[PDB]
Amino acid sequence: VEDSLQNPEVAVAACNAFLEANYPXXXXXXXXXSAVPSPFANTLANVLAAATKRNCNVELPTLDSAVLNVECFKKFACNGEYWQEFKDNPIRITTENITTYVTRLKGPKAAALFAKTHNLVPLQEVPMDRFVVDMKKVQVIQAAEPLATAYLCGIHRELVRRLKAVLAPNIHTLFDMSAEDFDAIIAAHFQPGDAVLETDIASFDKSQDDSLALTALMLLEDLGVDQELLDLIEAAFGEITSVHLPTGTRFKFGAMMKSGMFLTLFVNTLLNIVIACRVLREKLTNSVCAAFIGDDNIVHGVRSDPLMAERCASWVNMEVKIIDATMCEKPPYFCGGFILYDKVTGSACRVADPLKRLFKLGKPLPAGDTQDEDRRRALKDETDRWARVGLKSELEIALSSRYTGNIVRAMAKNFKKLR
């Protein structure tokens, strides 16, 4: 009955019909990791506008809600340490923090000559005046742009791991996390029949609650982001993330804006954590494992109640959407894939996602673009992962939950599915 599919064109037709039926190492769709238009990075622009209204304009019912948000975040997801130590010591990036950037990106002698080229006095904080200038607020000196980019990336790395410092051992973020670390975390705590609360947030591309922007600002301040770093980020992006990008247009941005995108994703993940602290409360603290990335989160051992939703809707312009899931029954989704249970090995693993991979190969690929796995071998090997018998039934029920239903055989001829 599955014999037609091993023709490539019946396969592509079944894929088109499936992807029409359900139309609406860790692809989240340095690093430390025909559509609707939205700004370059909306949430960062919101945060900087809130920073401007911190003094230019002064909003109780929003600032009080922001305070309640920060205190829920600090009580339900944090161990309770390093807050005064992080406030009393704002983030300052050294010349060593730039070496470990230029070496890990281009090499040791590159960093030697770079520091050697900008008088990077070692063990010393990088003096901001070497790459930003006041006007008579601040502005990037157009001469040395790589320095500003490197020190923005240093801010990003320090923010990431300081968040890692403040959070409780059960709260996990996908930053700085190797695939095998995530594998171990997933395998230790996910057995067949476990309850998993999955959550999506589909509105980080639109105006915040404004209390959420002010919350993110306060949490960045508590992490060590002072007014000077704020001024730096303003000069870097305060005139860039107010503009929408043409949908259907390829852009090859510089590194400063990949870093802007990075702390945008960071602020989004922070807001995800605070929203989960807001909805789950104690059930988040006592979970043995909670994972967050961007607008994706899963929480182990927690099941919904009729009254999570009256708080899920408590945000304007936000669509916070719960999903109840059960290991091997409702296989949960997280960050471009499912959490299945390989059960020849007897452990839970995370594997990628056919709907998203196929909707991804629905777009054309040129030759100038590097192809680590061209001609659908990146598809061949995870077809081999989800067409082996320790996974395939758990996956077919996962897709019964998501979405014939045996498209994995149709996925094996490559350039036909692009259409």
Side-chain angles (χ1 to χ4, degrees), residues 1 3-19 21 24-54 56-103 105 107-108 110-129 131-135 140-144 146-204 207-238 240-249 251 253-309 311-370 372-373 375 377-379 381-393 395-401 404-415 418-419:
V1 288
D3 67 3
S4 288
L5 262 51
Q6 84 189 313
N7 170 314
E9 279 158 335
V10 189
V12 169
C15 291
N16 289 325
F18 194 106
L19 202 83
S34 299
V36 289
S38 281
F40 181 63
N42 185 237
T43 64
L44 180 49
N46 295 136
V47 171
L48 297 182
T52 59
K53 291 183 289 182
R54 189 80 156 170
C56 184
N57 298 76
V58 287
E59 288 176 335
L60 275 176
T62 64
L63 184 147
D64 312 287
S65 56
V67 172
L68 177 73
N69 292 341
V70 305
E71 192 67 28
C72 276
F73 173 85
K74 295 191 169 178
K75 174 175 180 61
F76 290 139
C78 294
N79 54 68
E81 305 164 327
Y82 299 118
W83 286 110
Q84 284 175 189
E85 281 87 18
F86 283 167
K87 185 64 76 60
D88 299 337
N89 294 122
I91 297 171
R92 291 299 183 267
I93 295 292
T94 69
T95 66
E96 290 88 57
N97 298 155
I98 282 150
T99 63
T100 181
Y101 170 83
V102 181
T103 66
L105 195 68
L113 272 63
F114 196 80
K116 187 54 68 178
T117 304
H118 304 72
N119 183 13
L120 286 194
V121 61
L123 281 187
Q124 291 289 106
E125 320 181 325
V126 174
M128 290 189 318
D129 53 272
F131 69 87
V132 69
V133 58
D134 281 22
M135 291 302 292
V140 174
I141 304 111
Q142 61 270 8
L147 200 49
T149 58
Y151 170 27
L152 286 160
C153 299
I155 277 154
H156 185 50
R157 291 200 307 281
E158 186 63 19
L159 275 177
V160 163
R161 75 91 185 167
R162 268 167 173 245
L163 176 63
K164 288 214 172 203
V166 301
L167 288 174
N170 72 324
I171 308 296
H172 298 103
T173 185
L174 270 286
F175 290 120
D176 264 341
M177 186 156 285
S178 158
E180 278 77 4
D181 293 0
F182 188 60
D183 297 337
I185 290 157
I186 294 287
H189 305 114
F190 291 76
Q191 307 297 332
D194 282 296
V196 183
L197 197 160
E198 166 181 325
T199 311
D200 188 300
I201 297 187
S203 191
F204 274 115
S207 173
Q208 311 299 112
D209 188 47
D210 299 4
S211 72
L212 290 164
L214 191 68
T215 310
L217 177 60
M218 281 161 77
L219 276 179
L220 289 196
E221 267 181 8
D222 290 2
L223 280 176
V225 174
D226 57 358
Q227 202 68 23
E228 298 216 283
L229 293 186
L230 280 175
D231 291 335
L232 173 58
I233 290 168
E234 297 267 22
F237 320 115
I240 313 305
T241 60
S242 68
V243 192
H244 296 61
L245 277 298
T247 49
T249 301
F251 295 104
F253 285 106
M256 184 173 297
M257 301 165 174
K258 301 171 152 234
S259 74
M261 195 153 77
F262 279 6
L263 79 163
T264 309
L265 182 70
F266 181 87
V267 173
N268 285 350
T269 311
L270 210 45
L271 290 177
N272 191 349
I273 302 183
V274 62
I275 286 171
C277 288
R278 203 59 210 77
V279 165
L280 271 64
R281 283 186 82 91
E282 312 87 7
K283 309 206 279 213
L284 171 62
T285 313
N286 302 308
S287 173
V288 297
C289 178
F292 295 78
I293 185 53
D295 57 48
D296 282 322
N297 77 42
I298 65 170
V299 184
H300 177 277
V302 178
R303 192 74 74 193
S304 307
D305 50 40
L307 194 58
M308 276 174 198
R311 271 168 301 194
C312 297
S314 186
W315 284 277
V316 302
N317 310 299
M318 297 303 112
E319 60 275 22
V320 187
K321 189 70 176 177
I322 70 167
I323 299 180
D324 291 284
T326 318
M327 287 288 297
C328 302
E329 303 189 43
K330 286 283 176 273
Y333 195 93
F334 184 59
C335 188
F338 287 88
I339 305 280
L340 306 170
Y341 187 70
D342 181 282
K343 54 93 179 179
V344 176
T345 64
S347 74
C349 52
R350 184 256 174 186
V351 286
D353 174 36
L355 64 85
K356 178 174 174 178
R357 190 68 176 178
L358 173 77
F359 167 46
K360 186 266 183 179
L361 268 295
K363 310 295 184 290
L365 196 72
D369 188 57
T370 312
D372 62 312
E373 300 298 329
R375 199 192 68 203
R377 193 178 283 171
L379 184 59
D381 70 351
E382 76 177 5
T383 294
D384 293 357
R385 275 179 75 150
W386 58 60
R388 55 181 162 89
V389 173
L391 293 202
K392 77 192 326 183
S393 174
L395 183 150
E396 75 189 8
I397 290 170
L399 273 295
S400 171
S401 298
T404 310
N406 54 5
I407 209 64
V408 304
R409 185 63 237 180
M411 291 198 188
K413 307 183 170 188
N414 176 39
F415 315 105
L418 280 70
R419 276 308 287 127

